[PDB]
Motif scaffolding. Sequence first.
Motif, PDB file in Angstrom:
ATOM      1  N   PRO A  98      -1.806   1.552  11.462  1.00 18.45           N
ATOM      2  CA  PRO A  98      -1.229   0.262  11.336  1.00 18.45           C
ATOM      3  C   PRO A  98       0.121   0.321  11.671  1.00 18.45           C
ATOM      4  CG  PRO A  98      -1.206   1.545   9.202  1.00 18.45           C
ATOM      5  CD  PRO A  98      -2.035   2.404  10.208  1.00 18.45           C
ATOM      6  N   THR A  99       0.807   1.213  12.293  1.00 13.83           N
ATOM      7  CA  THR A  99       2.036   1.207  12.721  1.00 13.83           C
ATOM      8  C   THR A  99       2.081   0.126  14.010  1.00 13.83           C
ATOM      9  OG1 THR A  99       3.514   2.833  13.809  1.00 13.83           O
ATOM     10  CG2 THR A  99       1.466   2.850  14.630  1.00 13.83           C
ATOM     11  N   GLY A 100       2.981  -0.681  13.726  1.00 11.64           N
ATOM     12  CA  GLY A 100       3.439  -1.901  14.737  1.00 11.64           C
ATOM     13  C   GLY A 100       3.570  -3.135  13.936  1.00 11.64           C
TER      14      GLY A 100
ATOM     15  N   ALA B  13       0.856  -1.304  -0.014  1.00  6.76           N
ATOM     16  CA  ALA B  13      -0.094  -0.121  -0.015  1.00  6.76           C
ATOM     17  C   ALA B  13       0.849   1.427   0.167  1.00  6.76           C
ATOM     18  CB  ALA B  13      -0.939   0.078   1.237  1.00  6.76           C
ATOM     19  N   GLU B  14       0.278   2.344   0.223  1.00  6.00           N
ATOM     20  CA  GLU B  14       1.117   3.538   0.260  1.00  6.00           C
ATOM     21  C   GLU B  14       2.093   3.659   1.383  1.00  6.00           C
ATOM     22  OE1 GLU B  14      -0.230   6.975  -1.826  1.00  6.00           O
ATOM     23  OE2 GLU B  14       0.045   4.877  -2.806  1.00  6.00           O
ATOM     24  N   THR B  15       1.750   2.735   2.321  1.00  8.14           N
ATOM     25  CA  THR B  15       2.858   2.693   3.310  1.00  8.14           C
ATOM     26  C   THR B  15       2.587   1.617   4.258  1.00  8.14           C
ATOM     27  OG1 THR B  15       3.814   4.008   5.241  1.00  8.14           O
ATOM     28  CG2 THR B  15       1.693   4.783   4.672  1.00  8.14           C
ATOM     29  N   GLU B  16       1.136   1.441   4.908  1.00  6.85           N
ATOM     30  CA  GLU B  16       0.863   0.525   5.784  1.00  6.85           C
ATOM     31  C   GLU B  16       1.404   0.710   7.258  1.00  6.85           C
ATOM     32  OE1 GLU B  16       0.806  -3.656   4.712  1.00  6.85           O
ATOM     33  OE2 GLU B  16      -1.102  -3.709   4.137  1.00  6.85           O
TER      34      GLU B  16
END
Length: 19
Positions: free
Chosen positions: A13-15, A5-8
């Motif tokens: 979603p950080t983790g 994705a764009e970054t996820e």
Amino acid sequence: SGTEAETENFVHPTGSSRS
């Protein structure tokens, strides 16, 4: 890990443990 994705990973979603 993977990533597509764009970054996820920014705030929500950080983790890697659970997320």
